[PDB]
């Protein structure tokens, strides 16, 4: 009563699970995604070592097919051909995945939310939501053997957007993948090299949506009494680790239903930027940029986009 509750969720993993396969080359084992007659997986599966600079050219030319082993739930598929594209391999198999969902391939942009199906040994073990950050990394949860874990989005009509294959954990702990065309996000290298990412920026659009969710759930203590216009805030955001706000009218639905303007939520962001002190906001102890406007509206009112 007086709210619905804001909870971080992933979209259902079912249709993606039926595409996850166990891909083994030699003694190296990771995950692949099985669509049609093709299995896509990180190319470093054929690397004789993963803990040393890899000569991928040499790796592919000395590759032998009989060292490949592709299985789905322990049922082995027959490797027919292997081709290299960017940072991934496309493995042609005899059997075609009869559970291939209506799908497309999309490349994510900073600010996009998607879902991770964390897999090990070709078996999905966990599923969770993440945002592609401004520095083209994500804050996931992975350990050894996670690579090949698919990232995805499910459209309203049911089309699965495949957009991520886990590949790298940077020294900072930040995670990086490639799209299904081989492009490593943010132009990172699929090498165990020292790679540094840009400092992360707070997704200001998300924080605004979050604060609206907080209001719609009865949380009001943080509300600032002052207003700050869009240009005034963007000049502040560049200098305090926040993105620009785009674009004070997509929030017209929640501005209407709460009676609080975006400008009043922008001045609050400034004040709350410091910290929450002792207080709370919907269980979160600092400003939260994890939820998009779409996610919020979906959980509040049940509509999409």
């Amino acid at each position: 009563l007086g709210s619905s509750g804001l909870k971080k969720m992933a979209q259902p993993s079912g249709c993606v699970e039926r595409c996850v396969v166990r891909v083994c080359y030699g003694s190296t084992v990771l995950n692949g995604v099985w669509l049609g007659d093709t299995v896509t997986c990180p190319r470093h599966v054929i690397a004789p070592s993963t803990t040393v600079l890899i000569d991928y050219d040499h790796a592919y030319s000395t590759m032998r097919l009989h060292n490949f082993s592709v299985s789905h739930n322990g049922v082995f598929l027959g490797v027919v051909g292997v081709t290299m594209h960017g940072s991934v391999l496309r493995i042609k198999v005899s059997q075609s995945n009869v559970h291939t969902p209506k799908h497309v391939f999309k490349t994510l942009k900073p600010g996009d939310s998607f879902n991770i199906l964390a897999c090990y040994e070709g078996i999905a073990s966990g599923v969770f939501g993440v945002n592609l950050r401004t520095n083209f990394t994500i804050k996931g949860s992975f350990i050894n053997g996670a690579c090949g874990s698919p990232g995805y989005n499910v459209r309203n009509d049911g089309t699965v957007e495949f957009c991520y294959l886990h590949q790298i954990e940077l020294g900072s702990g930040a995670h990086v993948g490639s799209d299904f065309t081989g492009s490593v996000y943010g132009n990172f290298d699929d090498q165990p090299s020292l790679q540094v990412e840009s400092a992360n920026l707070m997704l200001s659009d998300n924080v605004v949506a979050f604060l609206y969710a907080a209001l719609l759930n009865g949380c009001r203590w943080w509300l600032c009494s002052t207003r700050v216009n869009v240009d005034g805030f963007n000049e502040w955001a560049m200098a305090n680790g926040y993105t620009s706000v785009s674009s004070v009218e997509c929030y017209s639905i929640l501005a209407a239903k709460t009676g609080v303007s975006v400008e009043q939520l922008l001045a609050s962001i400034q004040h709350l930027h410091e910290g929450f002190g002792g207080k709370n906001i919907l269980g979160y102890s600092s400003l939260c940029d994890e939820f998009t406007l779409a996610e919020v509206v979906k959980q509040m009112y049940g509509v999409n986009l």
Binding site: C147, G148, I168, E169, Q191, P192, Q195
Partner: peptide, 5 residues
């Protein structure tokens, strides 16, 4: 510093 998963 980075590692391949």
């Amino acid at each position: 510093x980075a590692v391949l998963x």
